[PDB]
Design a protein around this ligand. Structure first.
Ligand code: NAP
Ligand code: NAP
Ligand code: NAP
Ligand code: NAP
Ligand code: MG
Ligand code: MG
Ligand code: MG
Ligand code: MG
Lengths: 259, 258, 260, 260
């Protein structure tokens, strides 16, 4: 399947690790040019990405400092000539529960998780409308299902769903598609490092994984990436406003399902 | 139908006008005790709520100053002895489009529209858990459907839908119900006045209303209030995590309906 | 709260037991007139309903014989002068799994569970349109979430959700509201008797109920009926096309939700 | 992007024309072997699929005669050695409105549109379980949003959404994925001929198409096929229970959206 993204430029926030890095590698393997906005870039990931795409660039930035975004996006546009797509992906489930988290710390969380989805989109939109491209927001099942001990993250992810539908409305006229991916549980090195923090790592993974209908296993990075990159590409050219769930049946299948 | 809310205390933010005021009246006429947090209270609304409920109170506050909330919720709880329910309703569709609104102005909208939903709920939760009460977030169609030129309002309303599900999860163990109402188009005095600014106020109303399948007309305040007050009451004792749409079919029915 | 349904006629299929009966009692208790279409009517239920409404009627019918519905609906209309509302409620989870149920037996399931939602609505529509009334479909969580061993019941319940949206579209211009209620687990006498057949009825109840976030307990019949009758009443006069879930958080809340 | 479907066998019902034929061509173009169950096969299509896959086969069947399905599916499994995927696609919007369609004609519509989704899945399941493959139901926007003059089609497509969730629950343990595609308006040669019968076919097209936010234009067959074949493929190996909308924003975007 020819995704027709060769030499198309995609900025991926938090594209240095985990899900965002999976999306970047697949974008690169398919001939697109990925540009990573993230706090740091592991040297080995930088090497793999350069090997995949000679035009790849890393821009070091903490996106809580959203005033830096206009200057950085402008550089990207000058260096490469335009921007086709944006993946808003940088975020952290910081498990801030309402009963013990101040409103001030909620706002701090929105700085780390939410505001730059707006700012990145705002500054990329001039260029993405030119190329009739794509915006993709990585949200989370928690914005839909809740979880119970993570008010700051749940509302930020739901807000990003609202942004998805709002921007799909705003730029349908422009042939710019806006979609979101809501993963449930995706195995990343950070996740594995968080499980290994447990007295019984296997038991703890099993507690989570047994609630996932398709295989009692976490979604892989590659599985999120495949759906993300397909959705970004011209091959999804009538898909917009979609909250997509490659999630093993987590959100939609009977909660009592077991085997 | 006996709603079983005689003397139950409900705080209603933005409850001085429009939708929230309709909820306060109904809450009161069914025997509940409404407590209004809002920027100001029209004299005539203050007189009407006092006739409906001798224990009703108005607390003047701009909820962008969310640090005032802890003190005010503690006062309510000391005066009446507790709090059964909270309606987070204060908000403004401020039509802030992403392409011409700064990120600083996005955050100012969230001060006006979003953060106090969290803070109000935070400070009421100890009392509402005590009474195994109800929290109701008034959200908006736009958080689900989008609109096109109101990025700050759509994300905030969608965020409030996430709060609704998150809190329903957090407090199911406590027998606290958390739901939302997503109105589409609701006729208020202030909506009527915005329409009246138009050279042709009727044409502008009809332009909007024709999109509404059930009757080509706006939802009334009473219609939002009936569903809100029923949903808050003990008669909806197994309803939680719901986003309710008393919206004339706006969100769900074929867009091409005519 | 005044629901404004005094002397309004509502036909409730399967109104003789379970959820439908709880809906019939509340309708009558709030001043409405319930008309029950069901296979049989327990004597003690006929007595309670008669005490709640002097004009309540029972019509004995098995709704797989959908050709009988036109004549039955016509007699109701002549007797009472009209019909304000219809509750399509009669149905059975027959646990017909695709891998060992024939297509023929799927169709028989639809005769029992599905076709009469259409025929009842068809024959009631002329009267409900005259009174700008209300149609309510009792569906199921399984139509949305699936279950795994009940193909016939899940597709029938999902079909009824499509009927709900389609008829809400069709009759919005007539000011006829059409909605649905999707219960999850509702404690009925038949549910309790089903549980009492297990080696350990309490432990089987708790196995099912543990998955219900709000109170680890079944929804009650009253809880369903309250949301039903409110939604039918003129007080929900801008509510249509809705699939309502008074279900304890079953459909929408995080599947991993866990509290002791 | 390597879909990893080389030599995988997919049966596509109604795959002779329109959406199903676009899915068949792309399946073959990506190395899969398509098998079409349909009423008839245009010569020009049989030639194009034969050119694309030397193992492609057509089986003439009117899927209302669902008893024929077992023998046909068994023939496919012997000939090709197995079946990896099934696309349930055959169907017709017959615009049967409740107020002038009998229950008997509703049931006839289900024979044309619904029952064979069940029978095809039932008979294909042993083979698809063996290959841990995929089932894809083509449904319709109308099963979600209603339309207003087509009760039989809206309920059938909603029932297929129920089947999608129910089968996804039933076979997750077997690593069998079950999803659905809900198109809104898709331009097919048959849709174009239908538009051409109008006094002003361009005006009628634009009346329908102006409600589609993304581009004021119908979805293409290619657009449906691409999402279909990706979702069927092993590259969507954690996607199940999904109702997917490649529909230009038809279902989810603000009904009042208006530009130019
Ligand atoms: N993994 C899951 O199970 C799961 C489930 C649902 C949703 N998600 C979503 O997936 C997205 C990516 O998460 P992940 O699981 O891939 O986590 P991850 O492995 O920690 O990767 C996140 C990346 O984003 C970067 N980042 C985060 N916040 C940033 C900020 N304010 N400025 C700059 N860089 C930032 C991180 O940088 P450093 O680590 O170097 O600071 C890291 O490179 C998130 O939006 C999350 O909501 C993940
Ligand atoms: N009306 C509709 O068609 C519609 C549609 C969808 C959603 N909604 C939702 O309904 C809710 C109420 O809207 P409405 O139409 O009833 O508006 P409204 O008639 O203008 O009333 C809003 C009330 O909230 C108050 N308020 C707003 N922000 C506040 C703040 N930061 N602090 C204190 N008070 C504040 C206003 O006070 P002042 O005016 O005195 O400042 C006013 O009393 C909103 O959350 C909105 O999202 C309404
Ligand atoms: N209870 C739950 O947990 C639950 C959960 C989700 C959805 N629901 C839905 O709620 C509705 C009512 O179920 P329920 O739990 O109240 O069941 P129930 O206690 O068995 O009551 C059903 C009533 O409907 C009657 N009935 C069923 N099929 C009929 C037919 N073809 N013709 C005439 N009468 C018929 C039954 O009569 P006989 O018993 O005399 O045959 C019985 O009186 C059903 O549509 C079901 O799908 C229930
Ligand atoms: N096109 C749209 O705008 C649209 C929108 C939403 C959903 N859909 C869905 O997409 C699917 C395909 O429709 P389409 O638009 O591609 O229609 P189409 O162009 O008419 O193609 C339908 C194909 O299926 C065949 N077929 C239908 N019923 C059959 C039966 N009982 N037995 C055997 N073959 C049968 C037809 O055969 P003959 O024509 O030779 O009889 C034809 O080859 C349908 O399930 C429909 O619900 C389409
Ligand atoms: Mg920085
Ligand atoms: Mg103040
Ligand atoms: Mg009979
Ligand atoms: Mg045949």
């Amino acid at each position: 399947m020819d995704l027709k993204i060769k030499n198309k430029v995609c900025i991926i926030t938090g594209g240095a690790k985990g899900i965002g890095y999976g999306i970047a590698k697949l974008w690169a393997s398919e001939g697109g040019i990925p540009v990573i906005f993230s706090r740091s870039m592991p040297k080995e990931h930088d090497k793999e990405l350069k090997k995949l795409s000679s035009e790849y660039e890393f821009y070091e930035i903490d996106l809580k400092n959203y005033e830096q975004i206009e200057k950085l996006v402008k550089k990207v546009a000058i260096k490469h000539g335009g921007i086709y797509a944006l993946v808003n992906n940088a975020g952290t489930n910081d498990n801030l529960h309402i009963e013990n988290t101040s409103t001030q710390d909620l706002i701090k969380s929105y700085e780390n998780n939410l505001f730059h989805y707006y700012t990145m989109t705002k500054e990329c939109l001039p260029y993405i409308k030119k190329e009739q491209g794509s915006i993709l927001n990585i949200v989370s099942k928690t914005g839909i299902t809740g979880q119970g001990r993570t008010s700051a993250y749940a509302s930020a992810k739901a807000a990003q769903m609202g942004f998805t539908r709002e921007w799909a409305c705003a730029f349908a006229k422009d042939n710019v598609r806006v979609n979101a991916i809501a993963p449930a549980e995706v195995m990343t090195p950070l996740y594995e490092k968080w499980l290994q923090n447990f007295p019984n790592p296997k038991e703890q993974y099993e507690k989570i994984a047994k609630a996932i209908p398709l295989g009692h296993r976490f979604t892989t990075i590659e599985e999120i990436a495949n759906t993300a990159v397909f959705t970004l590409s011209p091959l999804a050219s009538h898909t917009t406003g979609q909250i997509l769930m490659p999630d093993g049946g987590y959100v939609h299948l009977d909660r009592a399902l077991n085997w």
